[PDB]
Scaffold this active site. Structure first.
Site, PDB file in Angstrom:
ATOM      1  N   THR A 207       0.780  -1.065  -0.381  1.00 44.63           N
ATOM      2  CA  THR A 207      -0.085   0.002  -0.085  1.00 44.63           C
ATOM      3  C   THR A 207       0.949   1.262  -0.241  1.00 44.63           C
ATOM      4  OG1 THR A 207      -1.103  -1.517   1.690  1.00 44.63           O
ATOM      5  CG2 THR A 207      -1.704   0.772   0.913  1.00 44.63           C
ATOM      6  N   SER A 208       0.070   2.089  -0.655  1.00 45.92           N
ATOM      7  CA  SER A 208       1.178   3.482  -0.387  1.00 45.92           C
ATOM      8  C   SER A 208       1.713   4.083   1.058  1.00 45.92           C
ATOM      9  CB  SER A 208       0.022   4.752  -0.792  1.00 45.92           C
ATOM     10  OG  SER A 208       0.361   4.912  -1.656  1.00 45.92           O
TER      11      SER A 208
ATOM     12  N   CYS B 163       9.104  -2.245   8.194  1.00 49.09           N
ATOM     13  CA  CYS B 163       8.841  -3.628   8.733  1.00 49.09           C
ATOM     14  C   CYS B 163       9.627  -4.424   8.783  1.00 49.09           C
ATOM     15  CB  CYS B 163       6.959  -4.085   8.627  1.00 49.09           C
ATOM     16  SG  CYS B 163       6.315  -2.754   8.851  1.00 49.09           S
TER      17      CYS B 163
ATOM     18  N   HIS C  90       8.353   0.268   2.903  1.00 53.15           N
ATOM     19  CA  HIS C  90       8.138  -0.932   3.331  1.00 53.15           C
ATOM     20  C   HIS C  90       9.110  -2.274   3.343  1.00 53.15           C
ATOM     21  CE1 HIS C  90       3.138  -0.828   3.876  1.00 53.15           C
ATOM     22  NE2 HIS C  90       3.728   0.269   1.890  1.00 53.15           N
ATOM     23  N   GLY C  91       8.986  -2.972   4.290  1.00 53.56           N
ATOM     24  CA  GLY C  91      10.231  -4.120   4.301  1.00 53.56           C
ATOM     25  C   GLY C  91       9.888  -5.199   5.307  1.00 53.56           C
TER      26      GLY C  91
END
EC number: 3.4.22.56
Lengths: 140, 92, 92, 141
Positions: free
Chosen positions: A28-29, A129, A87-88
Site C-alpha cells: 500500500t501507499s 517493517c 516497506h520492509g
C-alpha cells in the site's frame, strides 16, 4: 575515545523516501512518509549534513545509487548517514517494485569496499517493517 | 594493525526484529518523529547512543496505535539500536 | 500508559550477525575477555552503552586470529550491541 | 527519569550458562577457554554486586527449564536481570549440550507481560556464541 567529527564536512545524508509502490508488490501507499522525509531533511540540515533526497526508487535504482555513493571520495567528510523509508521485512527493504537485501545495500560501505569511509561511522536509519508481529504491550 | 570490515556501522531500526513498524498518516512514522525531535534538543548536549535511547523511550511510552480493527488496536513498538561502532559519536 | 513487551532488553552479542565468534584456549573468548576488562575499569564512571562501545574497540583493535590453517588465520571480529533499552544504565 | 533505578535492595541475578562439553551426536567440539570466561564473569559481576549463579553443561531442556524457573521468581526487590550464555550457536540459536534452542524461547520468559517483577527493569543478555560461519577478513589502517 570518540570519532573525529571536525573534517571540513559532516558527510552526506541520503534519504530514500519510497511512498508509491507498484500494485504487483502487494504494498500500500505509505501515507505520512513525506512528513518524515521533510523532517529528516531539516534536522540533518541543522547538523550540517549534505542532504540528498531521493523519491520512489526501484530496487535497481537503490543499488545503483548506493554503488555510486560508495565510490565517491569521502576523505574530507566525517561520517555517512543513510535513511531508508519504505516497506520492509526482516533483513529486507523495498524498492518501488520489489525487495532488496539490506546486507547488499550496506556492503558497499564495508571497510574493504569504501576506503574513504574506513574508520568513520556509517549510520543507517531504517523505517520499515521487520516482520508481522504486533507488540501487545503491558500496563504499568 | 587491522579493523573488522563490519566494524563502525550503526543500524538504527524503527522496530524490534520480527515486528511491524507504525506510521501515522499525518505526523509521520513514530520512529522518525521521535528521532527528529530527540536530535533537535539533544544533538548539542548528548552522544548519539544516548539520543537513540531517548528516541527509544519516546516511541515506547508516548505512542499507542488506534485502529477500528481490534487486531491492530492498542499496539506498541520499541526501536532497536544495533551498534557495531568503536568510538563515541558527538555531533559537535 | 503501557510499554512494549519487548522493551527494556539489551542483547550484547559477541559478534556481528552471520559470523564466527573467536575463543582463545588460555585467556577465554575475545568478547568476554574484553567485556570483563572494560567493566572492571569503567563501571563506576561510564554508562553501559559506552562501556560496550569500548568493548567493541578492544575486540576490534587488539585481537587477531592465529591459525596453522590458512582459512582461519588473520581473522578479525566486531561485537554487536542490540539495545531495546529505554533509559541509561549505570552500575554506579 | 532518563536512567534506570539501580537503588533497589538487590542489583539482581546474573545467570551464567557455561557449556563446554557437548554430546557426540551434535558433532560440536569442546569449547576450551570457556571456564576462564565463566570464572572471569563471576568475579566481574560480583563487584557489580550481582547474585551470580554459575551453571555448567546444561542440556537444551535444562536451559529452558532453568530460565522458566528464574522467570517465575519474584524480582520485586531487584534492580535488573543479567543472563550470560557461553556456547556454540547459529543466528538466533544457542546450543545446549544436546542440541539447539531458539534465543527467542529463552528470552520470551522475561518479556514485560510474562515477568511482571522485571517490567520496566533492564534485562541484559550477554551471548558468547557463533551467529553463522562467515569470517571477518578485516582491512588495514
Amino acid at each position: 575515545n570518540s570519532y573525529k567529527m571536525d573534517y571540513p564536512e559532516m558527510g552526506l545524508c541520503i534519504i530514500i523516501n519510497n511512498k508509491n509502490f507498484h500494485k504487483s508488490t502487494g504494498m500500500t501507499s505509505r501515507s505520512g512518509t513525506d512528513v518524515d522525509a521533510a523532517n529528516l531533511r531539516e534536522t540533518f540540515r541543522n547538523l550540517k549534513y549534505e542532504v540528498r533526497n531521493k523519491n520512489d526508487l526501484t530496487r535497481e535504482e537503490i543499488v545503483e545509487l548506493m554503488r555510486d555513493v560508495s565510490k565517491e571520495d569521502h576523505s574530507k567528510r566525517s561520517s555517512f548517514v543513510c535513511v531508508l523509508l519504505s516497506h520492509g521485512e526482516e533483513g529486507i527493504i523495498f524498492g518501488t517494485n520489489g525487495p532488496v537485501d539490506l546486507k547488499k545495500i550496506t556492503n558497499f560501505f564495508r571497510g574493504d569496499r569504501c576506503r574513504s569511509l574506513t574508520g568513520k561511522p556509517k549510520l543507517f536509519i531504517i523505517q520499515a517493517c521487520r516482520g508481522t508481529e504486533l507488540d501487545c504491550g503491558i500496563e504499568t | 594493525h587491522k579493523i573488522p570490515v563490519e566494524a563502525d556501522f550503526l543500524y538504527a531500526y524503527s522496530t524490534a526484529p520480527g515486528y511491524y513498524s507504525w506510521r501515522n498518516s499525518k505526523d509521520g512514522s513514530w520512529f522518525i518523529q521521535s528521532l527528529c525531535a530527540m536530535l533537535k534538543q539533544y544533538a548539542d548536549k548528548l552522544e548519539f547512543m544516548h539520543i537513540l535511547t531517548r528516541v527509544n523511550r519516546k516511541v515506547a511510552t508516548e505512542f499507542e496505535s488506534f485502529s477500528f480493527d481490534a487486531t491492530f488496536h492498542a499496539k506498541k513498538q520499541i526501536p532497536c539500536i544495533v551498534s557495531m561502532l568503536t568510538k563515541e559519536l558527538y555531533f559537535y
